């Protein structure tokens, strides 16, 4: 949390992967994934992609260094699938930030 903003809650988007197993998987596991992003402020960024990249890395770390505190565990597919949904949310957050 040293230097970050935390965005408000957003409805988790649906991600499609091109297999029914993956779609089904995500849809049943999505409650375990973030619904708010951590990010660094707008004005540190030259462009929206650099913003999104970081926002993904940071959120993912903060969510996993707090779920493992609970007692939770994530498969390597979960983090694949988290990267996907956190990307969309971060894109939404950049969008809120500029409007």
């Amino acid at each position: 949390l040293g230097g970050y903003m935390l965005g408000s809650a957003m409805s988790r988007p649906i991600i499609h992967f091109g297999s029914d197993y993956e779609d089904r998987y995500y849809r049943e596991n999505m409650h375990r994934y973030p619904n708010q992003v951590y990010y660094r402020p707008m004005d540190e960024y030259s462009n929206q992609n650099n913003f999104v990249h970081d926002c993904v890395n940071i959120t993912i770390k903060q969510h996993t260094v707090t779920t493992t505190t609970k007692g939770e565990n994530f498969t390597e597919t979960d983090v694949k699938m988290m990267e996907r949904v956190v990307e969309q949310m971060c894109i939404t957050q950049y969008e809120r930030e500029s409007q």
Partner: antibody, heavy 116, light 107 residues
Framework: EVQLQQSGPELVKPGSSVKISCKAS????????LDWVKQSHGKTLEWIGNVYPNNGVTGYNQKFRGKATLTVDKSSSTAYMELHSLTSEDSAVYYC?????????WGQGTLVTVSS | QIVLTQSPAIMSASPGEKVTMTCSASSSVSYMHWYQQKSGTSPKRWIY???KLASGVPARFSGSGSGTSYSLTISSMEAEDAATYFC?????????FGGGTKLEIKR
């Protein structure tokens, strides 16, 4: 490659409960999905619920909440369905179905009879 | 509770015939799956993700579809294919099964 064996056929007195099992044998899939499916009188198939064994998540058909409880045990790659409070309607063949992407494996079915 | 409705309910075909069975959905689904069941054995996935054949399923089989309309086709009807086929969907809890098409060969 993976074998799915399910426990032998049960006979239960009405009002009792039974726990049938199902184990991934020679499974190398870290995660994967286990479907439980009931088939009555040799035709109609109804989805009961599922578990992703490694680790946690459980989903139910509304219809079967309070009827089936689903749990797992990776101290032995075995999944469990507790059927609660059995009536003659619960007499069926209950299937175990492993899904991991392209691969699919269904067990051999466990036949429950609910009788005296 | 997407309702899968298969047709026909029972269907006799002559050998070498093209054979098409349908599965109609109450609401739109993204992929459809098909299982084959011969009496005695347990159901076994036959087609997954609408069009992909499960392992060891013969090549004369195919599936297609989108939205609310999905089909399964045997390009050339063969004795081993005589069985009951069910459709299945993974779009919403509860995942549901078709009523099953029973397919018989003529001889």
């Amino acid at each position: 490659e993976v074998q799915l064996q399910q426990s032998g056929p049960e006979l239960v007195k009405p009002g009792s409960s039974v726990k049938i099992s199902c184990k991934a044998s020679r499974n190398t899939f870290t995660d994967y999905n286990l479907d439980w499916v009931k088939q009555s009188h040799g035709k109609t198939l109804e989805w009961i619920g599922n578990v992703y064994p490694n680790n946690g998540v459980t989903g139910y058909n509304q219809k079967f909440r309070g009827k089936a409880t689903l749990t797992v045990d990776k101290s032995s790659s075995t999944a469990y369905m507790e059927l609660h409070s059995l009536t003659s309607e619960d007499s069926a063949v209950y299937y175990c179905a492993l899904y991991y992407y392209d691969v699919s494996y269904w067990g051999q079915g466990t036949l429950v009879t609910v009788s005296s | 509770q997407i309702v899968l409705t298969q047709s026909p309910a029972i269907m006799s075909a002559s050998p070498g015939e093209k054979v098409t069975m349908t599965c109609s959905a109450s609401s739109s689904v993204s992929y459809m799956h098909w299982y084959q069941q011969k009496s005695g054995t347990s159901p076994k996935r036959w087609i997954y993700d609408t069009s992909k054949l499960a392992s060891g399923v013969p090549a004369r089989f195919s599936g297609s579809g989108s939205g609310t309309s999905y089909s399964l086709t045997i390009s050339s009807m063969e004795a081993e294919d005589a069985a009951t086929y069910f459709c299945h969907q993974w779009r919403s809890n509860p995942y549901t099964f078709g009523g099953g098409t029973k397919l018989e060969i003529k001889r």
